[PDB]
Amino acid sequence: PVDVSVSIFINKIYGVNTLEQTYKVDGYIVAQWTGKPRKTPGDKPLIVENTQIERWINNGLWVPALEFINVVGSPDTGNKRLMLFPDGRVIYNARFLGSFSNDMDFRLFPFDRQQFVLELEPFSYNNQQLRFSDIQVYTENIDNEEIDEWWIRGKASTHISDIRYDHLSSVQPNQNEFSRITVRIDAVRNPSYYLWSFILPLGLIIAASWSVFWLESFSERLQTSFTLMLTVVAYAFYTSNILPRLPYTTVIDQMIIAGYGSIFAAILLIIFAHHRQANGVEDDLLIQRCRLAFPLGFLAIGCVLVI
Amino acid sequence: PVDVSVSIFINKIYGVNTLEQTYKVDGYIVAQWTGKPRKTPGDKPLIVENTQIERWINNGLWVPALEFINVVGSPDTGNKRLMLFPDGRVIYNARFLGSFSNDMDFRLFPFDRQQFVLELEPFSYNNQQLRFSDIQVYTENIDNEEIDEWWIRGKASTHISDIRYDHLSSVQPNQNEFSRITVRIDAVRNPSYYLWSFILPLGLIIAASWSVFWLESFSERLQTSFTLMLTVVAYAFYTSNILPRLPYTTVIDQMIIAGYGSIFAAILLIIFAHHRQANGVEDDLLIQRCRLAFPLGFLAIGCVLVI
Amino acid sequence: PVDVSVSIFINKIYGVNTLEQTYKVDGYIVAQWTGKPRKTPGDKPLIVENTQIERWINNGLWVPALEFINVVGSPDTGNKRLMLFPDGRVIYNARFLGSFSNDMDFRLFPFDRQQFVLELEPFSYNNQQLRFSDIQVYTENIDNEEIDEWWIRGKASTHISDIRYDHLSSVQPNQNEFSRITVRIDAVRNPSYYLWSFILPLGLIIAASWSVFWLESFSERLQTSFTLMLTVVAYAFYTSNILPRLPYTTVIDQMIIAGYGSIFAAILLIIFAHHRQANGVEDDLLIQRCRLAFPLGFLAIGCVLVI
Amino acid sequence: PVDVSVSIFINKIYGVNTLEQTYKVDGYIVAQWTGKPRKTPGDKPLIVENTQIERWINNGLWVPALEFINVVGSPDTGNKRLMLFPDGRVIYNARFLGSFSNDMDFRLFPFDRQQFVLELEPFSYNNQQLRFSDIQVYTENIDNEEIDEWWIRGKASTHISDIRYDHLSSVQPNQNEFSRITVRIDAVRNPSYYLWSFILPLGLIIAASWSVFWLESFSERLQTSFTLMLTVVAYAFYTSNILPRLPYTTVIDQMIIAGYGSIFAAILLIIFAHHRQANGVEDDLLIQRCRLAFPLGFLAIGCVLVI
Amino acid sequence: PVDVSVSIFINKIYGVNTLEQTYKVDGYIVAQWTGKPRKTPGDKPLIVENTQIERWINNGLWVPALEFINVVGSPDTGNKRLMLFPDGRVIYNARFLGSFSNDMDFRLFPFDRQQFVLELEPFSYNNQQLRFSDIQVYTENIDNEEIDEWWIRGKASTHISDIRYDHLSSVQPNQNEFSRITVRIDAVRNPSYYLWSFILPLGLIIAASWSVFWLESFSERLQTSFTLMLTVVAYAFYTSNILPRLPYTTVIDQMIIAGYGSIFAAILLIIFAHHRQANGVEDDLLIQRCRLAFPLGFLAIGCVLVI
């Protein structure tokens, strides 16, 4: 069972595809194991870069393929390196850029909490053939949180485990528990942009929506609400065009629906006030002055949405 | 006739292209057959990964090309593997990411029922040369339905069959029925987002459209319907910009048309009421009070559209 | 002069780029010719798949490059196959996906009639070296026309011809008429989506535009037309964002212009009616009642646009 | 100094990226030179296609790399060909698709005059090693100008010249003037679509904007201009979403700004008319009748913009 | 310690991805070092182009891999060249197109000051093995600033330094300070387009917003501001669709918020004026005439935003 020591260096995490639940990672992989002692020129470690690596493999050098389990497609591999020590030990170093998959919940956008995961596992060698001795992850990030879209919180969670496959090759005894490395990085979304440019004015719209009751005439009260309705549509559009596409409603989406509801509820009351009468024009002096009733009734329903 | 046992592992199904009728699948293929007994180092099965596979083929190893019949373009192949057993048997394992084609009906969006199909067939070897002994599909999915766009329903329907080609080479005996594997996975669209963010407010618009009849004056009744018309246009825009592009109308599309019709019908009636008179301003006391006539007349036409 | 028999199998025609006048084709090519008799293992035809083909060419196997004349870029090639018969004959089979170029007229969108063309020609061998004996095309399509964007009409038109190049090497006798295969597939656009979701409501807008004359007051008549103008703009936007980009106007585009014209003409008349007077407020009783004059005058100009 | 004769065949020029100042070219390159006499099978010219070319270079065939100086990225190379004559001369023929860079001025859009440039230069061989003897360019285009986005005017300008590099190796004598071929193709944009679908209705908007002065009341005059302002915004959006992205304003963009100005100027005058008084409601009978003053004053400013 | 002389030629800097903090660079790299004297054919320098380079490396030619530290993905490499002199020295020349990463602050858009950085470092060889002797950068740009999106200011800033890695191999003496080249190019955004097409009309909107106070009636004053609110939403949409996506607010974004505030503040005062009375309709003769109070009060808050 070959003991493999792994090191991951994370340079950049970007390009989150919400719909695909995907994110891009740039960094380096270092994998170390001890083979049989070699004779290197001089005695210093031998360096074998890109193209030459294949040439060594052909001559019988064992270099196990390490698969990224949760990679979408196949990574852009930059430079490759083999460091061959005379004492036997071998070090493989390579830069990579890949698209990774993970379960991502965006319900509470733009206040998401996400975690970026990497799953490493030998493509063909089982736990008895190849085993992950240890792993360290270096997230050389820091500073300038207000400049980046995501705020990295922890350092990097790590877990070496053994994954069992129940249906595999023509083997039944115990060659079935490939060892898997799982790296987890917690992150929080920078909610500044969405708060100031989306939440805030949307609030002002909903608030100004209620100002329709301060109008004197019934015709004024009613006709103005159609423009108000059309305003919310225009905002929904502005929101939808810029925000990330999802298969579910976010907090903002709910706020939008709330806006439609408030205006429609106002429409109903306005018509009601006018025609619920004991003459014809008996506009209920109190109901027309619900200028304070449902604005705070909206704040009650809004606080109920938090529950 | 070589007996080939196949195994497909499906990891992820995403990125449906409605216009192209296309979807992306990430997973692994396992193919097994029995060749002539080999002499492996020691006696344990020999593993041959990526690059080295070509080398073995060059020395005469028979590795038949299995084409994905319904693939669009050519799949991103990740790691490849050959497992060579001394008793003869050979196992080929490879990860893939592909775009696949299938007939997709989107007429009843967002309540579509779709099925994701995979078609496997030997590229060059006919049924008498190469035959598919059996196939098992593993869809290791489950849980979190309300997080994913699509809800997988069944487990995986499978069909091994023999496909006859009527026009081939200048060969005449019976070498024309290549064996094909067909995998089918049924799926249902998560309609939640479209119901709450599209259907619901659209309904409110159509409903509030009818509130034009509660207006007193004729000028009021008429002018307001122009803003109402403009509102439906703004919504059609908002709808179209976000919804998938299709060469046919969906349920939502029909709802939009219905909205245009309701308003246009109201325009006609409003003008009619005013000018269908026995004086000039004889606005038919009952026709102006069709505030209940066609809202339910719309619910009759709406229920007729279900038939 | 080598006689080459060709067979093209078309699987899918999709992804029309209007601006580039491009379309994507997936299918197979089969090329057959007779070489010098070989000695195959056993006596049955020898199969040579992908990688091994290059190896045979290196040893002197003549495999002539067939260029797609009207291909944009270079096709994604899938699996390749050589079938080598002992009697000499050779069959090359390959799957392809390419972007192809052709003159495409979109003036009468969404009622275009298009034809998809394929042009095959030997890259380096002239008519006296290599000649196309025959060609058959199999468009295995059928059914579900209302599901697909395009409706294939005929079977496939075919033409083998000889193309003369006037400027090549310093060669004079007659090595200049490369033989070219030209496949033509006629198709019609599925106009349903555009009729119901674009043409229909656009018509309703234009028709409702004329309802401005049923307004009593001059201020009502004029102010309302500004909303009406703004409505057409919103529609032009909705249209333009969804419809394909073109360097020329379509039928729909012309409809839009007609919309602007109707409203602008109305604006002119409205102002004219009011100020062409014998006092100040002499709104010409008949010109204000042009509520029927130019709606059918628009139907006369619309029918003139067909001529 | 090897004399190289070059021939470029241009098939298609498309996909202009305005922001990148890029355009796509599909075509063929023919390069000819005379080497030392060979012994070809028989005596006829020997053809060496794609893969086999590398094999010949490895055996010492000199095939100089010709770099496309203004190519963005590296060209999609289709088929390659070497024609080897027994008298010594060599012809290299290859199809290419590339993204090319050139200074592009889009100030006067949609009336741009552009020129598509190609720059060919030997990658490593200087004028004393390799020299471009002659070059002919074939632009096999013609007809259907109203169908294509761009109208090619000339026949293609050519220039062979010598480019001196001042900073190279520690080399001082005269190996520093690589020979460069420069091809120029002049072209004009098809302005039809932008004239009818953008310029024309934008004109109508600006013209109708001035109709605000024919309104009787001050409140009518003022309130209507806010819808008018909103109309220009909607148009700017419609324009911006469809037109190419640029880092500078075009003619159309200026027209938009003119629209904003006209309305804002009207706003100022309207308010001024009302409040510049000798009583309070003394609306200057002449200034309110600037229904003709600044429409033609706009046509004076518009004709000044041409200067 | 091998002395390496580097030369970078920058042809084009384009395609800035604001979200990814990425930019594209086209150019050439020249690397020079002196090896052991060779015997070249004749005596002149030997040129080895693309494919042939690998062949030389296989035979023991040392060609050290130089990694682009801040590259996203892996560069499109064009033509490669080796120049081998007999005196020993070796010159490697290659064209590249890459996506590079750097900290980019876009807060003060469209008046950003950015700097494009390139970081070069040997992939495997430390400062004692390989050392950067010198570097010169040639930015052959100039002229036509008003045609390009970015205006290059300086000539490039250059810095050779030694980067120490703290966690490496089981090596302890001092093999840890790889030598790194850092190139910096300062640039300024061309603000013309955003000033004239965004800032200017946005200003006119805000200015015209304040014209609501010149309206006589309270109903006019209030109802008009709902259109005015809707106008700002339409503008935000227009802005957001065309401007670059960021995770923070820009100057323009702030201007938009200011617009929402101005209108909402106006709404509050308008309602206040009307209902803050000593009777019912005592609209405060001075507060209604704050037609000049807060327009300059906004110019005070606007000037305070600069502090």
Curated annotation (Swiss-Prot), chains A, B, C, D, E:
The keyword Nucleotide-binding does not apply. It is found in: Cell inner membrane. GO terms for molecular function: extracellular ligand-gated monoatomic ion channel activity; identical protein binding; transmembrane signaling receptor activity. It comes from the Bacteria. It is a multi-pass membrane protein. SUPFAM superfamilies: Neurotransmitter-gated ion-channel transmembrane pore, Nicotinic receptor ligand binding domain-like. Its main location: membrane. The chain crosses the membrane at residues 195-215, 224-244, 255-275, 292-307. A motif (Cys-loop) lies at residues 105-113. InterPro entries: Neur_chan_lig-bd, Neur_chan_lig-bd_sf, Neur_channel, Neuro-gated_channel_TM_sf, Neuro_actylchol_rec. Pfam families: Neur_chan_LBD. Residues 216-223, 276-291 are cytoplasmic. Belongs to the ligand-gated ion channel (TC 1.A.9) family. Homopentamer. Mediates cation-selective currents but does not discriminate between different monovalent cations. This is Cys-loop ligand-gated ion channel.
